[PDB]
Amino acid sequence: MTATNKQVILKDYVSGFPTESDFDFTTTTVELRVPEGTNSVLVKNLYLSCDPYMRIRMGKPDPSTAALAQAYTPGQPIQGYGVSRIIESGHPDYKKGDLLWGIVAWEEYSVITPMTHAHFKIQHTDVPLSYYTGLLGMPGMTAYAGFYEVCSPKEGETVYVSAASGAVGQLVGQLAKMMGCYVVGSAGSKEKVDLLKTKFGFDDAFNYKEESDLTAALKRCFPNGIDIYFENVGGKMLDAVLVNMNMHGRIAVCGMISQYNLENQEGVHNLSNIIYKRNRIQGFVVSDFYDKYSKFLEFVLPHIREGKITYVEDVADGLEKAPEALVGLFHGKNVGKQVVVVARE
Amino acid sequence: MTATNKQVILKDYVSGFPTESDFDFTTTTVELRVPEGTNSVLVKNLYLSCDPYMRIRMGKQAYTPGQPIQGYGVSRIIESGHPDYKKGDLLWGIVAWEEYSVITPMTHAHFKIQHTDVPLSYYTGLLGMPGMTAYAGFYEVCSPKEGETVYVSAASGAVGQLVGQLAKMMGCYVVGSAGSKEKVDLLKTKFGFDDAFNYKEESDLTAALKRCFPNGIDIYFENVGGKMLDAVLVNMNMHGRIAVCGMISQYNLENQEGVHNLSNIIYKRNRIQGFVVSDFYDKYSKFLEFVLPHIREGKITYVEDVADGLEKAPEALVGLFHGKNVGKQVVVVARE
Numbered sequence: 001m002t003a004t005n006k007q008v009i010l011k012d013y014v015s016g017f018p019t020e021s022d023f024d025f026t027t028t029t030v031e032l033r034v035p036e037g038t039n040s041v042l043v044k045n046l047y048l049s050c051d052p053y054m055r056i057r058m059g060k061p062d063p064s065t066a067a068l069a070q071a072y073t074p075g076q077p078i079q080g081y082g083v084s085r086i087i088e089s090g091h092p093d094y095k096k097g098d099l100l101w102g103i104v105a106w107e108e109y110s111v112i113t114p115m116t117h118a119h120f121k122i123q124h125t126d127v128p129l130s131y132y133t134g135l136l137g138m139p140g141m142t143a144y145a146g147f148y149e150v151c152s153p154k155e156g157e158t159v160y161v162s163a164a165s166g167a168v169g170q171l172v173g174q175l176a177k178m179m180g181c182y183v184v185g186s187a188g189s190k191e192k193v194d195l196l197k198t199k200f201g202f203d204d205a206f207n208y209k210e211e212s213d214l215t216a217a218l219k220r221c222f223p224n225g226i227d228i229y230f231e232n233v234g235g236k237m238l239d240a241v242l243v244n245m246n247m248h249g250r251i252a253v254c255g256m257i258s259q260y261n262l263e264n265q266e267g268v269h270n271l272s273n274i275i276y277k278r279n280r281i282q283g284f285v286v287s288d289f290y291d292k293y294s295k296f297l298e299f300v301l302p303h304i305r306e307g308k309i310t311y312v313e314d315v316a317d318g319l320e321k322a323p324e325a326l327v328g329l330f331h332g333k334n335v336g337k338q339v340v341v342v343a344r345e
Numbered sequence: 346m347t348a349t350n351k352q353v354i355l356k357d358y359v360s361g362f363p364t365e366s367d368f369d370f371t372t373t374t375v376e377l378r379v380p381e382g383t384n385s386v387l388v389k390n391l392y393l394s395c396d397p398y399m400r401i402r403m404g405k406q407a408y409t410p411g412q413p414i415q416g417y418g419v420s421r422i423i424e425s426g427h428p429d430y431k432k433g434d435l436l437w438g439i440v441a442w443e444e445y446s447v448i449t450p451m452t453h454a455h456f457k458i459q460h461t462d463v464p465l466s467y468y469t470g471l472l473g474m475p476g477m478t479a480y481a482g483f484y485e486v487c488s489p490k491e492g493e494t495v496y497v498s499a500a501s502g503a504v505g506q507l508v509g510q511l512a513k514m515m516g517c518y519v520v521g522s523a524g525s526k527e528k529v530d531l532l533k534t535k536f537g538f539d540d541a542f543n544y545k546e547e548s549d550l551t552a553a554l555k556r557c558f559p560n561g562i563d564i565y566f567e568n569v570g571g572k573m574l575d576a577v578l579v580n581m582n583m584h585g586r587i588a589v590c591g592m593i594s595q596y597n598l599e600n601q602e603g604v605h606n607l608s609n610i611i612y613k614r615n616r617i618q619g620f621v622v623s624d625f626y627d628k629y630s631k632f633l634e635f636v637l638p639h640i641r642e643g644k645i646t647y648v649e650d651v652a653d654g655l656e657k658a659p660e661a662l663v664g665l666f667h668g669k670n671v672g673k674q675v676v677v678v679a680r681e
Contacts, residue, residue, distance in 0.1 A: 064579060064609050064612055064613070065612065067583065067609075067612040067613050068611065068612040069612075234607070234608065238607070253607075253610050253611055254611070255611060256607070256608045256611065259608050265605040265606065265608070266603070266605065267602070267603015267604060267605050268603055268604045268605075268607050269601050269602065269603045269604075270601075271570070271574070271589075271592075271604055271607075272570065272592050272595060272601070273619075274589055274617070274618075274619035275589055275590070275591065275592070275619040275620070275621065276619070276621065277619065278618075278619050278620060278621060278624070279618075279619050280616065280617075280618050280619075281610065281615075281616070281617040281618070282610075282614070282615075282616050282617075283609075283610035283611040283612070283613065283614040283615050283616075284611075284614050285611065285612075285614055288614070
């Protein structure tokens, strides 16, 4: 019971995109005894998530980023969302054998101190355990808190979801579709575009790469404009929708992933459109809404096991795949939510 | 009776900053009859407002070239067709830039002045459409709580003056910016804003806002836009609200500026809301009965800059767009 614990470290801060060279490996030899102090539990990490936000934590410390982020410390393992199994436990509502998703380091074994809106117990094991890094975890709670609470949606409205084949976009569009909304999506490839339109039931979709004039692409998809915009990309795309947006339109700014790897932030010109169209723009962060996760689960778990919700994963095997998995994410190599299976169970 | 009526005309559409020459004076002759229309009123324009948005209207509905320009102003009914108006009543709303206008009065386009125990030119600013822009955009759209830090852009203009005073009355820390020392001094000597800086002799701005706000900004009453929005976006506080009213720094630009710092709205989860004052005119009576007490007792002040006669009005409209006004730009077309 003194196990080797492989880890994957961030060497230093990233400028522009990350490469598989900004990360490194290590091995610790952890002892599998019960942990002491506070309410700690030792865990064996089964799955790891590669979410697009992880990029703002790879860059050098900035006070505004630190509102969200708090950067990865160089030479220390990448922290992220994972689902793990409780080896030993010094906590009340956690015993050996239990499953937890929450925030864990990118490694095999992790002593963690479970906090209310940091770690969540898996009660249901009818679904794949890796569904708790996307659909039933933080990316699913993002789509629910952002579409139902932040986009103030009404049945029949036209929704535009950018980057629609990522874990939050492919669920946002369904949540909307289960309300009679007209949904168009965008993705960067026709294989992913054809999944939005067929497997995900979007009414239209387009390759934002194949379209030259993005305000014209949105114009032929939304003949009667846009009332909700689930903002995952930013920059050039945001100017395209402020033009096509309707009056009293809402923009929920979830992430702005076309800007994260730019060391030179793009300019949004059309912001004045919001005056006369009386558009609301609201940034949000899931963490605020984790008070409603029990309400999210009891909602979506029905729809899942009734064929009303579809979800595509992209599984990479083992912790050694994690750096190339995470680096390809920011270039869009994945087709659904990208999972890394550390240890299976 | 048959008066001559002089008009300030838009000669033709502008591009860039307008000059005194994009306008010409004419005269038409007015029969001072009970009017040439349906549920019309003939009116004698007393005052006129030089309004910033007017420049959007000057580019290529917009104003017609060859026709007068239209703006907000205070007037007095000479002859009335409308059952609500008699001779001698005062009215504010959209008038033409002439001595006499025939207008068909309507609800939230045109309002009737009842309290005459205030200066009549207040109805072009403080108790007219700028006053209702500050009321509505501060109390409805910025969701203020006591003690918040409020930053008003163009703090010296007609809206900015009242927002900082409504913010100060509610116990908020107010900071405004203006483009001259004179305009930057009124904000403490008259209005009491907790601070102020000259956004022209400040090649800082993000650092200007960082200095005035050690604790960051919670509310931004936005009137200018662009590069000032970027500085504010880096200074906002968590759950900080921006109420977008106008973006005056862009109106005379042929091609507009970009905002680069828009990603901070995620991190700090900012509400940015656009609004238009006319959506709120149904609350005009609530505004008026709340603020006339304060005015009357010297609690809500006002600085206005007055031009006299329609002849000094092209020079005054252009001057506003070049920042030359100190306070609200009125034009006396005729005293009472």
